[PDB]
Amino acid sequence: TIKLIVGLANPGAEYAATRHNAGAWFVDLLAERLRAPLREEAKFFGYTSRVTLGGEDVRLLVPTTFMNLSGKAVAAMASFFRINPDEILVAHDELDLPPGVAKFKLGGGHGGHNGLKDIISKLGNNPNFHRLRIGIGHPGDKNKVVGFVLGKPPVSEQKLIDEAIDEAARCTEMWFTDGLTKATNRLHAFKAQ
């Protein structure tokens, strides 16, 4: 089962609407719907909250370390509550999926995402945690990636990302009540059928 949900981001109003904060948008949505506000806790290097999802006790985390230093926050929370890597779900922006699509994945590398890279490192070089890949599209080549992920999406793309995040939230809840297989089958069918 999942005990911790992490949403990757950079802190501050300066980065709030940028693509690289897609993971945080997901966590914010969960907290908003449950009316369980996130509060920054120094000890965990990020915003935290505790909610009941599908009847289960789940903790939320949005690091305030800056993206490339995210591992520090995930490791601090996981160590205090004694949570295993496969009991963690990390939501993040995904260049390899278009806006409007989202997918679950267990393990694998970081694929060039520096937030994921640091988490793998800080968990003791262990990539075996779950991920919610939120599609943001790809600009074309590596040279344009920096300005793209740190850029704000046009309104039409934002609407598509919001739809995927909403569906992803419902499927995450389904994971708790009905299991990962059913939750995955529903999410991966979104926009595919």
UniProtKB/Swiss-Prot annotation:
Does the UniProt entry include the keyword Iron? no
The listed outcome for H20A is: Does not restore growth to a deletion mutant, kcat/Km for charged tRNA(Lys) is <0.8% of wild-type. Loss of catalytic activity
> What Gene3D superfamilies does UniProt report for this protein, alphabetically?
Peptidyl-tRNA hydrolase (3.40.50.1470)
Which Gene Ontology molecular function entries are recorded, alphabetically? peptidyl-tRNA hydrolase activity; tRNA binding
Q: Is Hydrolase a UniProt keyword of this protein?
A: yes
Q: Where does tRNA bind?
A: Y15, F66, N68, N114
Q: Which residues cross the membrane?
A: none
Effect of mutating D93A: Complements a deletion, kcat/Km for charged tRNA(Lys) is 0.8% of wild-type
Keyword entries, A-Z: Cytoplasm, Hydrolase, RNA-binding, tRNA-binding
Q: Broadest EC class?
A: hydrolase
Which residues does the UniProt site feature Discriminates between blocked and unblocked aminoacyl-tRNA point to?
N10
* InterPro entries tied to this protein: Pept_tRNA_hydro, Pept_tRNA_hydro_CS, Pept_tRNA_hydro_sf
**Biological process per Gene Ontology, one example term:** rescue of stalled ribosome
Q: Which Pfam families match?
A: Pept_tRNA_hydro
Substrates-to-products reaction catalysed: an N-acyl-L-alpha-aminoacyl-tRNA + H2O = an N-acyl-L-amino acid + a tRNA + H(+)
EC number(s) reported in the record: 3.1.1.29
Per the record, what is the consequence of mutating H188A? Km for charged tRNA(Ala) increases 2.6-fold
Q: What does this protein do?
A: Hydrolyzes ribosome-free peptidyl-tRNAs (with 1 or more amino acids incorporated), which drop off the ribosome during protein synthesis, or as a result of ribosome stalling.
- Assembly notes: Monomer.
Family membership, please give it: Belongs to the PTH family.
Give the comment on domains: Recognizes the backbone phosphates and ribose of the tRNA acceptor stem and backbone phosphates and ribose of the tRNA T-Psi-C stem, allowing the enzyme to recognize tRNA in a sequence-independent manner.
Name of the protein? Peptidyl-tRNA hydrolase
Encoding gene, per UniProt annotation: pth
